[PDB]
């Protein structure tokens, strides 16, 4: 009763204090100081390859770490591994549950991870002595659908689900080692830091949280959007990250100065974003939309400098290689394309 | 064949066999009927499955050489706007409503009784953007107990604006018309309504007939004639 009111008032003035401390450290935005440099020219990228063979909507893709192999997942029930240079197919994997929503590639090349809408995260081994792929582990313990997964090393993995929970799993033993709690709504995405001692996650409560893998507690919270967060990614330096929301807006957040840096939006874009990704030097931000096409933003001046318009349905997933040679986009039309 | 080495010419054939398998597996997915099952908890979904029994739960059965797969999503408890578009291309939606619940009052907010929640859920799933061309098969459940519960207590408790004689036939007819009045497409959408109470093989036959009509119209539209 009275304790409830006093605690609520205290927490509210704590929120006021956080806001005032955040506002006292801002004196100039990114546009002011970057108003000096020269804009990149219009980027023309052509479809160099077209990977085809999926029979339904494509939901996720991930680039292998050698910049030549990639994996993709569709509601057809298939997980496919491609060779980008020659357009060859290397492996096809059948799934037990058709309703998949994520996939990931291990940074060594030995494992892939899949899962969605079944509360499970399955781990497959690519390099076995018997010439096929068989399921190596099957992590259970979430009470909602899986919306992202990323390998930390060859024996750890991090997941986010629809029960407003993130988890860290030791694949060897098979149980959660750390549980990350604190969102109030469904968690839609996560991304790992370059050194893998931190990660960021984004949820349907219109906020983002930074987590510490070692000590397992929330470090920092980011607000400013107005709808779900569908996509999130780190800057190559590891000191910034960009979010893509459901209100036709992208945003850039800065870790050491917990502010908002810049907004990527236009008055003729009214539909939401599905995917966000960065360039090798962090000069380009690519965003996938559901107006059927992709957009390229000069990530330092907030103006559009290209369009990847070659898809017939919604653009669901998107990625850039580790050397920066190509871009891949997958679509609800069941096609994948590579741009250079 | 000329630029290719001898080892690059075995990767091509491996990829071609992968293509063959992916193609031949897609002709078995397009030859099965997919249904999405909805209800309001204890709405008789369990018994309607029991009459057709062979995270998300999947049931499959067969009748007159036609494979059916029901998807039941009653345990998700998540925000439905994030995964409702996965079922965009199903054949039909089966909605189960128990009409022995005109007297029961829902727990969470005692004022509003359960059939009002059922009509809310029907009106929410009927007018979705993802299901603008999908048909709805409606089952009205527990009509046995309705007959005993209607004579002692009038349905005026839930329907004060109802002027009848509390007679079984016209009360049921008023309820069925009241449900079918929630539709707002009326041109690309049809609602099939059935009365059921632990009845045998009538539910399966009803589903088969309704799906046959759905597929007939879909084929007729496919060629531009419809």
């Amino acid at each position, epitope marked *: 009763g009275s304790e409830l009111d006093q605690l609520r008032q205290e927490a509210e003035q704590l929120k006021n204090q956080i806001r005032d401390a955040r506002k006292a450290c801002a004196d100039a935005t990114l546009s002011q100081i970057t108003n000096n440099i020269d804009p990149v020219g219009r980027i023309q990228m052509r479809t160099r390859r077209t990977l085809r063979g999926h029979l339904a909507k494509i939901y996720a893709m991930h680039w292998g770490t050698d910049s030549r192999l990639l994996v993709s997942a569709s509601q057809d029930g298939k997980l496919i591994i491609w060779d980008s240079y020659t357009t060859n197919k290397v492996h096809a994997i059948p799934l037990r549950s058709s309703w998949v929503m994520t996939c990931a590639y291990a940074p060594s090349g030995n494992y892939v991870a899949c899962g969605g809408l079944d509360n499970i995260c399955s781990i497959y081994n690519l390099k076995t*002595r*018997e010439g096929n792929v068989r399921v190596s582990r099957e992590l259970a313990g979430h009470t909602g659908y899986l919306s992202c997964c990323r390998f930390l090393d060859d024996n750890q993995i991090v997941t986010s689900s629809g029960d407003t929970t993130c988890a860290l799993w030791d694949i060897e033993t098979g149980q959660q080692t750390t549980t990350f709690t604190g969102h109030t709504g469904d968690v839609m995405s996560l991304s790992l830091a370059p050194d893998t001692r931190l990660f960021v996650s984004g949820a349907c409560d219109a906020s983002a949280k930074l987590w510490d893998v070692r000590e397992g507690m929330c470090r920092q919270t980011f607000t400013g959007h107005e709808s779900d967060i569908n996509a999130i990614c780190f800057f190559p330096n590891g000191n910034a990250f960009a979010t893509g929301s459901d209100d036709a807006t992208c945003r850039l957040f800065d870790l050491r100065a917990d502010q908002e840096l810049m907004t990527y939006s236009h008055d003729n874009i009214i539909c939401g974003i599905t995917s966000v990704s960065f360039s090798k030097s962090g000069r380009l931000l690519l965003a996938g939309y559901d107006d059927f096409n992709c957009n390229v933003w000069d990530a330092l001046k907030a103006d559009r400098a290209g369009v990847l318009a070659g898809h017939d349905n919604r653009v669901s997933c998107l990625g850039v290689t580790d050397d920066g040679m190509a871009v891949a986009t997958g679509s609800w039309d069941s096609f994948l394309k590579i741009w250079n | 064949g000329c630029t290719l080495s*001898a080892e*690059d010419k*075995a990767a091509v*054939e*491996r990829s071609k*066999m992968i293509d063959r398998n992916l193609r031949e597996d897609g002709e078995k997915a397009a030859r099965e009927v997919k249904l999405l099952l909805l209800g309001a908890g204890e709405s008789g979904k369990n018994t309607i499955v029991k009459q057709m029994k062979i995270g998300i739960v999947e049931t499959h059965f067969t009748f007159k050489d036609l494979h059916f797969k029901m998807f039941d999503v009653g345990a998700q408890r998540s925000e439905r706007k994030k995964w409702i578009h996965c079922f965009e291309g199903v054949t039909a939606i089966i909605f189960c409503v128990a009409l022995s619940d005109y007297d029961l009052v829902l727990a969470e907010d005692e004022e509003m009784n359960r059939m009002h929640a059922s009509m809310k859920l029907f009106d929410s799933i009927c007018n979705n953007k993802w299901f603008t061309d999908t048909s709805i098969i409606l089952f009205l459940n527990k009509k046995d107990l309705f007959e005993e519960k209607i004579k002692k207590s009038p349905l005026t408790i839930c329907y004060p604006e109802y002027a009848g004689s509390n007679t079984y036939e016209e009360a049921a007819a008023y309820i069925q018309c009241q449900f079918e009045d929630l539709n707002k497409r009326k041109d690309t959408k049809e609602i099939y309504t059935h009365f059921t109470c632990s009845t045998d093989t009538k539910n399966v036959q009803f589903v088969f007939d309704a799906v046959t009509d759905v597929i007939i119209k879909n084929n007729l539209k496919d060629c531009g004639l419809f």
Partner: single-chain antibody, 232 residues
Framework: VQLVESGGGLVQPGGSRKLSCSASGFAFSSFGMHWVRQAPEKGLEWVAYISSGSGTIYYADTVKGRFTISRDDPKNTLFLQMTSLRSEDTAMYYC??????????????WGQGTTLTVSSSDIVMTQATSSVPVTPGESVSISCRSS???????????LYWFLQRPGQSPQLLIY???NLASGVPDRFSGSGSGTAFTLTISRLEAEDVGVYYC?????????FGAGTKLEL
């Protein structure tokens, strides 16, 4: 994982024969299969190749059209049929498995082969040495030379190094002249360029005694050099 060959023995001068292998322990339906000769006190030379799917077949120009490879995929049984036999077919035949996709390491598991004694252009691979005496602990080298470049345009170099111990079947050591097979120590290494190549060992143990062979896989026919033997 294992391959079991059968069918060998003493045959009449003019005759026929049938050789099988049974594959147990892996996914036989996704492996291309080779047969490979080796004469007594001599090198080993390739026979024939059937790919996964039984769509492509290659033969040995010394038996081309006089042999036949065949496959039974449901029951995991590979066949070779010698339709006509002659004096110079006295050897022992091995069966080797191989898979071709980006990053694979063909010629992994070599089978065990069966002996077969009969009653009585192409690239040039040359191992100039025949025997090498060397005491443990000190680094050793072996050399192999071609008649032309094996570096394709795509960047590969289809040179293979592998080893036969005294009384044992061979095992892969180095595929594509740079990469190391699975289960073998880092003591071995392969280097070279153009047409000339060297295999080397840094720390010498008592398990390296044997005979080394170099192969090329640039195109058919697949050609082997003579043996370069090492002694303790």
């Amino acid at each position: 994982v294992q391959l079991v060959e059968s069918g060998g023995g003493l045959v009449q001068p003019g005759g026929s024969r049938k050789l099988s292998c049974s594959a147990s322990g892996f996914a036989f339906s996704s492996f291309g299969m080779h047969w490979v000769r080796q004469a007594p006190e001599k090198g080993l030379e390739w026979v024939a190749y059937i790919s996964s799917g039984s769509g492509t077949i290659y033969y040995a120009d010394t038996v081309k059209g006089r042999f036949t490879i065949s496959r039974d995929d449901p029951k995991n049984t590979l066949f070779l049929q010698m339709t006509s036999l002659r004096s110079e077919d006295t050897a022992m035949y091995y069966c080797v498995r191989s898979i071709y996709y980006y990053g694979s390491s063909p010629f992994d598991f070599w089978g065990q082969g069966t002996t077969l004694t009969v009653s009585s252009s192409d690239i040039v691979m040359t191992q100039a040495t025949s025997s090498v005496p060397v005491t443990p602990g000190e680094s050793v080298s072996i050399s192999c030379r071609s008649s032309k470049s094996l570096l394709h345009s795509n960047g590969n170099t289809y040179l293979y190094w592998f080893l036969q111990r005294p009384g044992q079947s061979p095992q892969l050591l180095i595929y594509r002249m740079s990469n190391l097979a699975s289960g073998v120590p880092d003591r071995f290494s392969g280097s070279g360029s153009g047409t000339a190549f060297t295999l080397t060992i840094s720390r010498l143990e008592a398990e390296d005694v044997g005979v080394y062979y170099c192969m090329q896989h640039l195109e058919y026919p697949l050609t082997f050099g003579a043996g370069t033997k090492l002694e303790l």
